[PDB]
Amino acid sequence: ARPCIPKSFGYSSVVCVCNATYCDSFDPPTFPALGTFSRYESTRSGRRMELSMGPIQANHTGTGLLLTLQPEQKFQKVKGFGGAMTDAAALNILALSPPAQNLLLKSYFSEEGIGYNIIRVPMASCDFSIRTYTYADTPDDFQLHNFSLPEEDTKLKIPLIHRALQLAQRPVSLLASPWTSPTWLKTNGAVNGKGSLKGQPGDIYHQTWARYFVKFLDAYAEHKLQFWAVTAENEPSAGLLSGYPFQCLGFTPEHQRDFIARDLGPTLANSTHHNVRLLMLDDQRLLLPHWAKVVLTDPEAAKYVHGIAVHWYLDFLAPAKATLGETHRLFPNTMLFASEACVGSKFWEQSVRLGSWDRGMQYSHSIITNLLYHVVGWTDWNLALNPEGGPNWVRNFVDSPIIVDITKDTFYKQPMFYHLGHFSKFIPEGSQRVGLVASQKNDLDAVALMHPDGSAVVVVLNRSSKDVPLTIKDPAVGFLETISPGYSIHTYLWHRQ
């Protein structure tokens, strides 16, 4: 429908420029006829999810790299893909003119964009906020008589969420996560730094905090928003470290276990929101499988836990298999879910690198490794940031797939946006990842899934500089002859009957 308007900022690749009247968009999706495949291509050299089609060949010799589909090797089903509606993201989106806001939201949520179906919502303030607040800042208000949603929710977050759901291709799932409790529930009486809930699981500080989840959900329900899930706490390990700079609330895995068992599970289970799922951890995978053991080998906490949530930030010093794989080995019936990722990365590179192809590859690299190790979904951090990677009240600036330039009523779609798009647009909720074996050692990253309609989707990422010729075999159908260009990512689709 409309192509990328490219612009260079002197990094490895370009961004796609959008404004009030223009943004790159897709045509409505069409089924490739049986015996054909669809290919979506993005390249460092400038191609941005271009649609092309080819034949599936009945025969193939000799020769070189072959990746064979295994429809009988069935693994996890997919929950979905999305990002976080933080104070910082919402504030940036709304600072644009209304027509630019819509193109922005369609890019993420529409069928003319990348079909996101998860939105993470912080419960009150985090570091990507411009002030600290919780929903119950009256000291010692154990009854939560003064619990209320501030404007951050009622004027920025919630209206943006509604407009996304309205644009949305697919049913959208909301995920909620707290950074800090009110400061009077905490041993250090501050939103940041080392500190946890006062007293012990089962007591009034613990029961009040559990009740605060219920009040949060009650309040969102009044604005016609239902949650798919909540996490027990964002990065519980963070609140264990002295001088921790921004909002946190410390739990050892034992504390989380008992908090879930005593307070948070029963409270949620006895509320009108009993169907909301609870995910534990919500922190770096380096904490697995230990954290999952402590919590899930206690059946009183296990009965309340639907899933384990993981953060991507390092990560690089904890190989998937030893963390993600082991945990699945031990609790195959507790889903793994990536609830937060950003870049990053690095201490000598700027927070925002407009046009960075490398950062795009890190996303898709991580998404593929995640899928290969059982993870059922993936959630980017901030949906939009400014060219500084903010705002952020502790200046903890990071990058985002969409960068808003408020003076120019313009936004930039980075490579990360598209690299994400290669998964989000084409893997709906209910897809099942399947086997895919390589006939020879290669430099590609690849993953195959089965769409709920029976069709196939395979994503191939090439992080080397060299083109790599390859064929994908599907026994039901034949052979896709293709080439993977250096510094590219392709998604391949085709019907099976």
Ligand X SMILES: O[C@H]1[C@H](O)[C@@H](O)CNC[C@@H]1O
CB of 101 to a copy of itself, least distance (A): 33
Q: Helices (H) and strands (E) in the chain — how many of each? A: 13, 22
Taking alpha carbons only, the member of 497, 461, 434, 470 closest to residue 69 is 434
Which partner, a copy of itself, ligand NAG, ligand X, none, binds residue 5 by CB below 5 to 8 Å per kind? Answer: ligand NAG
Interaction partner, residue 342 (ligand NAG, ligand X, a copy of itself, none; CB < 5-8 Å by kind): ligand X
Q: Using the rule CB under 6 A, which residue among 3, 7, 21, 346 binds ligand NAG?
A: 21
Catalytic (active site) residue 326: no
For the chain, how many residues are written? 497
Question: Which partner in ligand NAG, a copy of itself, ligand X, none is near 165 (CB below 5 to 8 A by kind)?
Answer: none
316 binds, among ligand X, a copy of itself, ligand NAG, none (CB under 5 to 8 A by kind): a copy of itself
Catalytic position from the list 41, 152, 235, 429: 235
Amino acid letter, residue 87: D
Helix axes 98-109, 87-94, angle to 10 degrees: 130
Identify what 275 binds: a copy of itself, ligand X, ligand NAG, none; CB under 5 to 8 Å per kind: none
Any contact of residue 345 with ligand X (CB under 6 A)? no
Q: How far is the CB of 247 from ligand X (least distance, A)?
A: 8
Q: Any idea what the Cα angle at residue 424 is, between residues 422 and 427, rounded to 5°?
A: 95
Instruction: Compare residues 76 and 284 and give the one whose CB is closer to a copy of itself.
Output: 284
Q: Which one of residues 76, 86, 177, 284 is an interface residue with a copy of itself (CB under 8 A)?
A: 284
State which residue, 234 or 431, has the beta carbon closest to ligand X.
234
CB of 126: closest distance to ligand X in angstroms?
A: 5
d(CA 310, CA 326): 14
Kindly provide the b/e burial profile for residues 189-219, where b requires at least 16 CB atoms within 10 angstroms of the residue's own CB: eebbbbbbbbeebeeebbbbbbbbbbbbbeb
**Least distance in angstroms from the C-beta of 279 to ligand X:** 14
Task: Specify whether the CB–CB gap between 112 and 26 falls below 8 A.
Answer: yes
d(CA 376, CA 229): 14
Tokens representing 470 are 């390859």
Binding pattern for the stretch 181-220 against ligand X, x by CB under 6 A and - elsewhere: ----------------------------------------
Nearest distance, CB of residue 99 and ligand NAG, angstroms: 10
Sheet of 384-385, strand order: 6-7, 15-18, 410-413, 402-405, 384-385
Site residues for a copy of itself, 383-412, by CB under 8 A, read 394-397
Alpha helices, H only, 282-356 = 290-296, 299-302, 320, 326-330
Note whether 235 binds ligand X by CB under 6 A: yes
Residue recorded with tokens 């007591």: 203
| CB contact set of 448 (below 8 Å; sequence gap of 6+) | 67, 69, 70, 433, 434, 435, 436, 456, 457, 458
322 binds a copy of itself (CB under 8 A): yes
Q: Give the Cα separation of 393 and 132 in Å (integer).
A: 9
CB of 243 to a copy of itself, least distance (A): 6
Active site residue 50: no
Ranges within 416-475 binding a copy of itself (CB under 8 A): none
Mark residues 212-241: x for contact with a copy of itself by CB under 8 A, - for none. Answer: -----------------------------x
Q: Which residues 125-164 are close enough to bind ligand NAG by CB under 6 A? A: none
Beta-sheet pairing, 488-494 with 173-178:
unpaired
- If contact means CB under 5 to 8 A according to the sort of partner, which of ligand X, a copy of itself, ligand NAG, none does residue 407 touch? none
Least distance in angstroms from the C-beta of 58 to ligand X: 49
Measured distance CA(47)–CA(203) in Å, rounded: 58
Q: Which of 26, 40, 81, 128 lies at the binding interface for ligand X (CB under 6 A)?
A: 128
Catalytic: which of 340, 349, 388, 429?
340
The one of ligand X, ligand NAG, a copy of itself, none whose footprint includes residue 346, by CB under 5 to 8 A per kind, is a copy of itself
Spatial strand order of the sheet with 468-474 comes to 50-55, 36-43, 488-494, 456-462, 445-450, 432-438, 66-77, 468-474, 478-484
Tell me, residue by residue from 171 to 210, as one string, x for binding to a copy of itself by CB under 8 A and - for no binding.
----------------------------------------
Q: Which two tokens stand for residue 43?
A: 């390249």
How many CA atoms lie within 13 Å of 5's alpha carbon, on the beta-carbon side?
Answer: 11
By CB under 8 A, name the binding residues for a copy of itself.
241-245, 284, 286, 314-319, 322, 346-349, 358, 394-397
Which residues of this chain interact with ligand X, rule CB under 6 A?
A: 126-128, 234-235, 311, 313, 340, 342, 381, 396-398
- Which residue ranges make up the site for ligand NAG (CB under 6 A)? 5, 17, 19, 21-22
Catalogue the active-site residues.
Answer: 235, 340
